[PDB]
Write a protein that binds this ligand. Structure first.
Ligand SMILES: [Mg+2]
Ligand SMILES: [Mg+2]
Ligand SMILES: [Mg+2]
Ligand SMILES: [Zn+2]
Length: 890
């Protein structure tokens, strides 16, 4: 396979200054004429001029109006256009091409494609070369003049990046529009859209300069009503970047566009952000609660890229985390400010420690700045995004808000209008660090290891208290497991946010402080500590590590009840759960492998269950927090702690633990399910698409979590509650009623009821598909076959394919059926999908990432299916790289 290496980066011998495009859309072809105003750089050594250009049909090629001919002045192999050096000018020149492309048959959704009746582009990372020839890499920055023409009746709205500078009629019922984007950009930020789109709009006046910005949000006509929350989220986003970062929008217009067929969530094209409809459109009658948070986050994310990615862009794709880690950090700051709920940060932590930790212990483990790739699309990973965001957040923890803001400013201003690298960012932060420490010899050179070193650090603790001296110590050790990226691991700069809790009275004993661990081990000592404390470690989850708290369950309970920090309370709960899960898993595993006729299980700690009851019954405690405490850790979290995992033993373990606790708490759960109803399902704001009460949303999640626990328990007469809950106006409730009805004969009646409620809204139907797919049904395989035949059919819409299959892959007992039939089913879907959408196919590989964690029978079954997929003729480069790396062949 062709591999690209970070260390091999070199500036191009060429410069592209201006791009002038004419994109003429017809029924059965689109013609792209492009003029590149180019020059020779100071790095040129008289090389051939080589353009990327994938699957283009050439009409004409010229330089300075000299026609060039195949085999004489150029070669084209359907991937690269090589202009031989003799015909490459030595000073500024005009390169002209005209090619034919076919959006109507572009089911890969990269380049120019058709999504329902909308023509749309996606260029990040390497899609622009599927539209026209280019030196398609992000250091080739240029200015764009784009004309789009099409049939006026079919495609009345025409958009490209920047200012609309003309609109005109064309004979034969056609029309055109011309766009000028005055901001230099890499080609991955080009976009065009053509469609019968409807819109909502508003005017926003910037905070400092008072610039009037016109905000447009667009969709197909059927769904225009569902645009309102996205428009509000955009205004919130603009105001947050102004308020926190001093950053104002930099064009007279910003358009957001929803399309039905999109490989990811959205895309930050300059002035023209394009979204998966699932991440832009909602209405309260037709969307689950989680859509609201998703839209806030995705709108914010793409908006924040306007500076962290667009105004400062990437030198090369190895630097991806510079824009994604940083942008995810910005959107997390924004969403924590907008939602004002502790469960927002907790959800980010849960994501990282489940999916990203799994990745980082897998054969796919990479640092957040990778050293090599075949298909850059395979490095848009939870590592680069989520570990990247945590590395970007640690700078704020280390510097505090004022100095973080100063370092950020240094970065964004120095590199404005240009490319940057991870080093540039670290250097700006280092400037702020010198200022914070008032020491111009302090440096963050060690910090760079967070970019280059793979794997998750493990941080462990020991404690000592001297009662006579009133002195306490915390001894800390870090360890990162060697891997294929580094045989020798180095210690990182790990910021440890800490408090100390008095176990007598539950009160804070120190001003919170952040310990700066830089060595492999260190001991931090505290004086004037009046009683032996319980330490509250890694507050806010202050580094992306495995924490070994070395606390007793009694200590953990006291923190769960009394600490101030949400994360530590939740983590202490998590750790009590983990200790139980491991112990019970081992007891079940021994019983199974020894074929014992009887054995013991360690019961769940009774004082821990009392603590759960105390928290749930506290009318002043947080509803979202409560839903985290009654839930066991995610299976993908748990699997980071078990080698040769027998999935069926794990399912048995979880069931036992849940049943132990419900046998004590089900009456509390039922009482709370009823008591929370009035506030949870109050209809304030039900007609207001500009406002969401996230606390109320958390109350609904708590109610629906409790209902699931009581339904699996078969709590007496709970089917009555299930039927009532199905009549709620909130889709989060009525779809929950379907899921929880899985344990009852009413399942298929609720399946039909909710289908009918869902079938006339594209996105609600996809949410119904996910609800079915995730259902805890013994007959899940027959239900999946029913979904395939009656609803999915031959959809190539990634959202439909993902909705049917991915939730089912999270079914621990059924997806991991020892026959291998779940592995075979998903491998067939992957291979089917790879023939038209390689990116989606690689997404659908997700459940195989943990293969080498499983028991050896399931390792074998998984490996057989991965090798079967690797044998498939015409396998994509995306899938082949992914599977070769995952199976230890690359
Ligand atoms: Mg083609
Ligand atoms: Mg993105
Ligand atoms: Mg459809
Ligand atoms: Zn992004």
């Amino acid at each position: 396979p062709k591999i690209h290496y970070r260390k091999d980066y070199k500036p191009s011998g060429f410069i592209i200054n201006n791009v002038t495009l004419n994109i003429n859309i017809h029924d059965n072809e689109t013609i792209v004429r492009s003029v590149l105003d180019m020059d020779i750089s100071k790095h040129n050594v008289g090389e051939d001029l080589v353009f990327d250009g994938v699957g283009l049909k050439i009409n004409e090629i010229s330089i300075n109006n000299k026609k060039l001919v195949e085999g004489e002045e150029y070669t084209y192999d359907n991937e690269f256009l090589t202009i031989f050096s003799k015909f490459v000018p030595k000073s500024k020149f005009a390169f002209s091409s005209e090619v034919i492309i076919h959006p109507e048959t572009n089911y890969a959704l990269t380049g120019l494609y058709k999504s329902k009746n909308i023509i749309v582009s996606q260029c990040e990372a390497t899609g622009f070369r599927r539209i026209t020839f280019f030196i398609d890499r992000p250091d080739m920055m240029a200015k764009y003049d784009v004309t789009v023409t099409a049939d006026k009746e079919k495609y009345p709205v025409l958009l490209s990046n920047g200012d609309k500078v003309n609109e005109f009629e064309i004979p034969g019922g056609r029309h055109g529009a011309r766009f000028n984007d005055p901001h230099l950009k890499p080609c991955y930020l080009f976009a065009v859209v053509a469609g019968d789109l409807k819109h909502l709009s508003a005017t926003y006046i910037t905070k400092y300069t008072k610039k009037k910005v016109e905000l447009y949000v667009f969709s197909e006509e059927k769904y225009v009503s569902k645009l309102q929350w996205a428009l509000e989220c955009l205004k919130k986003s603009m105001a947050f970047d102004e308020d926190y970062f001093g950053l104002e929008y930099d064009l007279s217009r910003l358009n957001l566009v929803a399309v039905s067929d999109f490989n990811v969530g959205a895309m930050e094209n300059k002035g023209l952000n394009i979204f998966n409809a699932n991440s832009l459109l909602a209405s309260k009658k037709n969307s689950i609660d989680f859509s609201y948070a998703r839209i806030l986050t995705v709108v914010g994310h793409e908006y924040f890229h306007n500076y962290t990615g667009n105004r400062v862009t990437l030198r090369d794709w190895f630097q991806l985390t510079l824009k994604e880690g940083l942008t995810v950090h910005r959107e997390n700051l924004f969403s924590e400010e907008m939602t004002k709920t502790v469960t927002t940060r907790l959800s980010h932590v849960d994501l990282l420690r489940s999916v990203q930790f799994l990745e980082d212990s897998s054969p796919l483990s990479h640092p957040i700045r990778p050293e090599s790739y075949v298909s850059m699309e395979n490095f848009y990973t939870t590592t680069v995004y989520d570990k990247g965001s945590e590395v970007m957040r640690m700078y704020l923890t280390i510097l505090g808000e004022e100095y973080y803001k100063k370092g950020f400013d240094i970065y964004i201003k120095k590199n404005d209008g240009n490319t940057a690298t991870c080093e540039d960012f670290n250097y700006a932060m280092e400037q702020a660090y010198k200022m914070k420490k008032a020491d111009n010899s302090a440096n963050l050179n060690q910090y760079l290891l967070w970019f280059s070193q793979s794997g998750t650090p493990h941080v462990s603790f020991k404690y000592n208290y001297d009662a006579e001296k009133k002195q306490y110590s915390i001894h800390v050790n870090q360890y990162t497991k060697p891997d294929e990226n580094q045989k020798e691991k180095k210690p990182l700069f790990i910021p440890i946010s800490v408090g100390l809790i008095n176990p007598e009275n539950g009160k804070e004993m120190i001003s919170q402080t952040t310990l700066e661990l830089t060595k492999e081990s260190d001991t931090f000592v505290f004086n004037n500590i009046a009683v032996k404390p319980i330490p509250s470690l890694f507050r806010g989850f202050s580094a992306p590590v495995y924490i070994e708290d070395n606390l007793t369950d009694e200590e953990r309970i006291l923190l769960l009840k009394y600490d101030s920090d949400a994360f530590v309370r939740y983590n202490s709960c998590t750790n009590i759960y983990m200790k139980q899960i491991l112990m019970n898993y081992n007891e079940f595993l021994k019983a199974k492998n020894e074929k014992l006729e009887s054995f013991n299980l360690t019961p769940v700690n009774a004082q821990f269950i009392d603590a759960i009851k105390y928290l749930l019954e506290d009318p002043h405690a947080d509803a979202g927090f409560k839903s985290y405490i009654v839930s066991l850790p995610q299976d993908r979290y748990i699997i980071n702690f078990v080698s040769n995992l027998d999935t069926d033993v794990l399912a048995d373990t979880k069931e036992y633990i849940y049943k132990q606790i419900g046998d004590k708490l089900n009456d509390v759960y039922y009482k709370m399910f009823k008591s929370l109803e009035a506030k949870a399902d109050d209809l304030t704001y039900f007609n207001d698409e500009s406002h969401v009460d996230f606390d109320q949303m958390n109350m609904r999640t708590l109610r629906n979590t409790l209902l699931s626990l009581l339904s699996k328990a078969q709590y007496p007469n709970i089917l009555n509650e299930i039927i009532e809950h199905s009549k709620s106006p909130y889709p989060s409730n009525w779809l929950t009623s379907l899921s929880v009805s899985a344990y009852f004969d009413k399942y298929f009646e609720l399946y039909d009821k909710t289908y009918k409620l869902s079938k006339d809204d594209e996105l609600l139907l996809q949410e119904w598909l996910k609800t079915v797919s995730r259902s805890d049904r013994k007959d899940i395989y027959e239900i999946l076959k029913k979904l395939e035949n009656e609803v999915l059919k031959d959809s190539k819409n990634p959202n439909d394919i993902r909705a049917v299959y991915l939730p089912f892959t999270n079914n621990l007992r059924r997806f991991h059926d020892i026959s291998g039939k779940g592995y075979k089913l998903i491998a067939e879907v992957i291979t089917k999908t790879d023939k038209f959408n390689p990116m989606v196919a690689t997404q659908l590989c997700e459940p195989f990432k943990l293969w080498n964690k499983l028991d050896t029978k399931r390792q074998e079954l998984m490996l057989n299916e991965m090798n079967t997929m690797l044998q498939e003729p015409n396998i994509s480069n995306n899938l082949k790289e992914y599977l070769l790396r995952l199976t230890n062949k690359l």
